[PDB]
Design a protein around this ligand. Structure first.
Ligand code: IP9
Ligand code: ZN
Lengths: 98, 365
């Protein structure tokens, strides 16, 4: 279970894959388990969780620009393999599940 | 009234005489539909703008509180001055004020269009006032626009920043990844359509160039919403102006509907292989991924007259078979809701008389 950065250039020294923990913290704060810096990304921006039942669930923090397959989300939402995620201005990621 | 003695309580009662007033206003000429998306039976209002709108649009108006403040016509208490404003305004008033100067090529959203289109329509009119003040339209009215747009790679599926240039002079959209441009797309062959869901991005625009009976799909987006929509409408300006000169004698009214085509239906079906399907007017394209650059295959859907029929069942649950003069194409849908639709979108083609160019397209397939 990993996220690809859809804006990373393979021909450049750009980090292309971020791996997810079972309870993954995403944001700008050093604490976050995936640290992203950019326009409109809070110290604590998101939370992705891998369930014991096997499913992937995204939980946006309040007052955050967050889209999943192009639509905004302000409550929790289940992710599927291949779904596309946008956070803030241009933190644009795809999801792959095993 | 009040009650006698020390406590002396004020009672209001069930009157609701003021939100009754506004309700009666919904029967005035021009207020039958959403001021912004045209959806019937609006039941919300912006009282600072004095327009009558649907639930969905009213949501978008709440984001613009410096311009619009909303109340339910039925579930909200209304101050007296607020009813007065509605009474002395309404949707016809707002058309004359805020839609005063709307270029005939500028795209007007329908209720089913994506959120970006509907929000940027409301903001254009009311916040920016793009159609009171012509100066504000320069981005899509100069006939030349250039800027960077995140574009999807052909096969790698990444989205990388690339300079684009729409130029009406040459009559083409072109991009550079540079000296000469990486590609040059003749405006005669451009279509543009918003596809946020497919593209995975709220600002996702699908641009198609049709060279040699093949239709390349380009998938692009802009970090800012206004800019992608300006791009969208610039493209429409480009097509329009191109078409006026390509076809004078044709009216603007006859040319606007051609500017850009939105698909009647897309979604998966079985062909058994699962493929993605796009019904663009007459060419049923199909794909491995929806973000494929080129159709895996196409299928021409002609007319009842040219020996084309669509049929239910097969000789997945619900089937639709497209009987052509050469061969038959069996398709399986998941749901009946879809089968219903997919078939309805095909029948539109079977019914209509073919044009000469459509014979030329058929002659290929
Ligand atoms: O790195 P890669 O070489 O793996 O990827 C290329 C890139 O996506 C190009 O897009 P772009 O750089 O022009 O944005 C694309 O051209 P296209 O621009 O037409 O999508 C080209 O296909 P192609 O050259 O079309 O065959 C791909 O090979
Ligand atoms: Zn509306």
């Amino acid at each position: 279970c990993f996220l690809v950065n859809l804006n990373a250039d393979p021909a450049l020294n750009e980090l292309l894959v971020y791996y997810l923990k079972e309870h993954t913290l995403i944001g700008s704060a050093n604490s976050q388990d995936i640290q992203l810096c950019g326009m409109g990304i809070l110290p604590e921006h998101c939370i992705i969780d891998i369930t014991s039942e096997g499913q992937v669930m995204l939980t946006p923090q309040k007052n955050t620009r967050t889209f999943v397959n192009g639509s905004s989300v302000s409550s929790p939402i289940q992710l599927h393999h291949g779904d596309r995620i946008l956070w803030g201005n241009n933190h644009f990621f795809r999801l792959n599940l095993p | 009234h009040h009650s006698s003695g020390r406590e002396n309580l004020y009672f209001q009662g069930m009157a609701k005489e003021r939100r009754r007033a506004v309700l009666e206003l919904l029967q005035r000429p021009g207020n039958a539909r959403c001021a912004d998306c045209g959806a019937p039976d609006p039941d919300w209002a912006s009282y600072t703008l004095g327009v009558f709108i649907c639930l969905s649009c009213s949501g978008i108006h709440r984001n613009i509180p410096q311009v619009s403040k909303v109340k339910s016509v039925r579930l909200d208490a209304w101050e007296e001055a607020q009813v007065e404003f509605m009474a002395s305004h309404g949707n016809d008033a707002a058309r004359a004020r805020f839609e005063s100067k709307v270029p005939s090529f500028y795209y007007r959203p329908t209720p089913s269009d994506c959120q970006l289109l509907r929000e940027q329509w409301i903001r254009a009119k009311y916040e920016r006032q793009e159609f009171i003040y012509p100066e504000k339209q320069e981005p899509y009215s100069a006939g030349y626009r250039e800027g960077f747009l995140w574009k999807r790679g052909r096969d790698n599926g990444q989205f990388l920043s690339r300079k684009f240039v729409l130029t009406e002079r040459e009559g083409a959209l072109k991009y550079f990844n540079a000296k000469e441009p990486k590609a040059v797309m003749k405006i005669e062959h451009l279509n543009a359509t918003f596809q946020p869901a497919k593209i995975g991005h709220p600002h996702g625009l699908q641009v198609t160039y049709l060279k040699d009976n093949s239709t390349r799909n380009i998938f692009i987006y802009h970090e800012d919403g206004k800019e992608i929509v300006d791009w969208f409408n610039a493209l429409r300006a480009a097509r329009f102006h191109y078409l006026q000169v390509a076809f004078p004698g044709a009216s603007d009214a006859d040319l606007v509907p051609k500017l850009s085509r939105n698909y009647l239906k897309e979604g998966y079906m079985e062909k058994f292989r699962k493929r993605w399907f796009t019904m663009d007017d007459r060419r049923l394209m199909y794909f491995k991924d929806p973000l494929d650059a080129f159709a895996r295959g196409e299928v021409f859907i002609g007319s009842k007259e040219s020996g084309y029929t669509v049929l239910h069942g097969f000789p997945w649950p619900h089937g639709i078979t497209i009987v052509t003069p050469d061969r038959k194409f069996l398709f399986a849908c998941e749901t009946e809701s879809d089968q219903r639709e997919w078939v309805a979108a095909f029948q539109k083609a079977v019914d209509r008389p073919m044009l000469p160019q459509e014979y030329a397209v058929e002659a290929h397939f």
